[PDB]
Design a protein around this ligand. Structure first.
Ligand SMILES: [Cl-]
Ligand SMILES: [Cl-]
Ligand SMILES: [Cl-]
Ligand SMILES: [Cl-]
Ligand SMILES: [Zn+2]
Ligand SMILES: [Zn+2]
Lengths: 373, 373
């Protein structure tokens, strides 16, 4: 296989379906990428994650740089060998989780220094160090290091952070290219910033296209703005990105947000929602989410979802899973998580099939009517 | 298959190997029965437990009567259907965990009343109610309800509790026999008591044989007496039991205790040790137990054990499992538990094979030399 080849097989309005071919495997798009390094609640073997239909998983640079450490992972043969997943891995840059999880931070044009939320040890990230860490992990899709823009943001702060992010995108590009092994075997995605401002989104897209990336993420969304606003921003933002490269919506999200984002040209998604939901008792179904802890499920012998093809729905009852989750059993979290991740993959498959067949608009309508009935 | 048929295929000294045929399947003896209802740390699907080699699992009446409740389980089709295990299940009587886990207790000749350690709700167990609950669960091997003897015990208290236990054994026998569906489809085991006193052990064995049971447990051991004393008690106690029925050592235990107990005529074992050990970081190996949390394993790419045939040892490194357990990940507990349960099954298989081949004495010697090297 090639290092990277994105091919669009079919289109419907702004929606696209196709494939990304990489050395470690093919990724079907639109794609959902489950998190493979979720704190505390990692509950599935790699074979199980693959069985749900996932083509690629996401690794968190921030968590991995703290435990077990990036240099250690490299010594042990890289992240694929370490965790036992041989297909593509996308790594985030670490920047977002520094801002959201670390205890103290000092930000500058060079990068950020921070204290671990685990033991208060001191660490550093910069465009160069982030790219280096993602190299040590051996990830297949590397994210450029950017500076987060909180929500809401003033026009001035949105502009400043977008501008810094574009300077950092060039630094990321150069760091990636200067490492032969990484440049020849991995891909690099840039991240569009600009908050809710169309002019800043345009400047960011133009800067990123001038530098040139293998894919383009829409950053700065799913940070509390609400679906209406997120959709409004996607409406103008996605068409600014190169049409012939994948479009990645970071941190999204809920099933309806995914459907609407595909309607607006997005090809790739990640979110902790399905994995985190599991242990907390939330199961996704075609008739909307349910909370399995609710007493109404205590004697319900039906599967979590009536149509779901997953191994959990083939074998396990709502009543048993209700009991396991109530009783604080590890197995309850395992079953909920396997189902939720599988549900998301079945959603993506239905999206892909409907675009290929020219009936995605109808699917989106039918999906919403039932999911929110 | 028959309701119950124990057949001894080979012997070596006091050790025996054979099979128990029951309606739901065959159990190879000597057998280890993993707990299927362990509080909080249940971390394996039934298919995985079966894959380790387990022929039968143990269910805890005390836990199940509190959550989800015995009547509820019966309404949902019985414990096999509820939890998804279609092979034999042995249930304990509930009596031991009442004494060890419940907050307040009132004991009498009729039984025991107690408060749940979960919510202080009031509950009751008696020979009749225990047998009824085990019927509602639908277990295949039902344990008679007895009265626990703490360690150490005075001769008078050991005698009193043994005598009450024998009265309760007759009540258990009669309750079991009076329930047609249970009597025709399940088996009933009696429990020998008498603490460390040979004369009381003899009286207990005689009383149990007069009543007649499908199998005989040696109760009152593994309660803090130490291996030397446990072995001394087994030396005289096991030969008092009917030779042609299975001998079950409740709550044992460590690998060397299991080997020594087989040398003394024991056919069946249960212990939470392998399952509890997992999340706490203890892995059993042929070279003795290790604690995977130890820093020495952080870069160790070898499997937990060099010869273990389990799926964990085929795929996973010590370094990864070390990381998962340190990081508090559910998957770490899953992997440790699968390996430990599989290790125990491989131990039992080696014991069975060695008895069949007349080389169990040699196996026991070789096992100990390596395990304690
Ligand atoms: Cl602001
Ligand atoms: Cl419950
Ligand atoms: Cl006493
Ligand atoms: Cl670690
Ligand atoms: Zn499902
Ligand atoms: Zn193993």
């Amino acid at each position: 296989r090639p290092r990277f080849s994105f091919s669009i097989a079919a289109r419907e309005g702004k929606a696209r379906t196709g494939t990304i071919e990489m050395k470690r495997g093919v990724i079907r798009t639109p794609a959902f990428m489950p998190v493979g390094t979720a704190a505390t609640v990692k509950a599935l073997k790699p074979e199980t994650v693959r069985a749900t239909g996932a083509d690629i998983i996401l690794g968190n640079t921030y968590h991995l740089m703290l435990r077990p450490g990036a240099e250690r992972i490299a010594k042990l043969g890289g992240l694929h060998s370490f965790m036992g997943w041989d297909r593509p891995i996308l790594t985030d840059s670490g920047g977002y989780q520094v801002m959201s999880l670390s205890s103290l931070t000092k930000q500058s044009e060079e990068g950020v220094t921070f204290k671990s939320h685990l033991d208060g040890s001191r660490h550093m990230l910069s465009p160069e160090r982030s790219i280096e860490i993602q190299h040590l992990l051996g990830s297949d899709i590397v994210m450029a290091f950017d500076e987060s823009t909180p929500y809401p943001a003033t026009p001035s702060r949105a502009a400043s952070s977008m501008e810094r992010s574009m300077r950092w995108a060039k630094r990321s590009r150069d760091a990636f290219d200067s490492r032969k092994e990484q440049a020849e075997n991995a891909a690099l995605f840039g991240i569009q910033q600009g908050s809710v401002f169309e002019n800043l989104r345009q400047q960011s897209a133009d800067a990123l296209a001038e530098i040139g990336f293998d894919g383009y993420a829409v950053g700065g969304l799913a940070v509390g703005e609400g679906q209406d606003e997120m959709f409004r921003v996607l409406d103008f933002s996605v068409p600014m990105l190169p049409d012939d490269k994948p479009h990645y919506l970071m941190g999204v999200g809920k099933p309806d947000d995914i459907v609407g984002a595909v309607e607006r040209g997005i090809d790739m998604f990640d979110s902790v929602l399905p994995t985190r939901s599991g242990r907390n008792g939330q199961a996704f179904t075609w008739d909307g989410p349910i909370n399995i802890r609710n007493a109404r499920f205590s004697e319900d012998l039906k599967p979590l979802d009536s149509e779901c093809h997953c191994a959990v729905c083939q074998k396990e009852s709502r009543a048993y899973i209700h009991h396991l989750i109530r009783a604080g059993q590890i197995l309850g979290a395992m079953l909920m998580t396997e189902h939720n991740i599988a549900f998301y993959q079945q959603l993506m498959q239905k999206i892909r099939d409907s675009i290929s067949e020219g009936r995605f608009s109808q699917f989106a309508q039918d999906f919403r009517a039932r999911y929110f009935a």
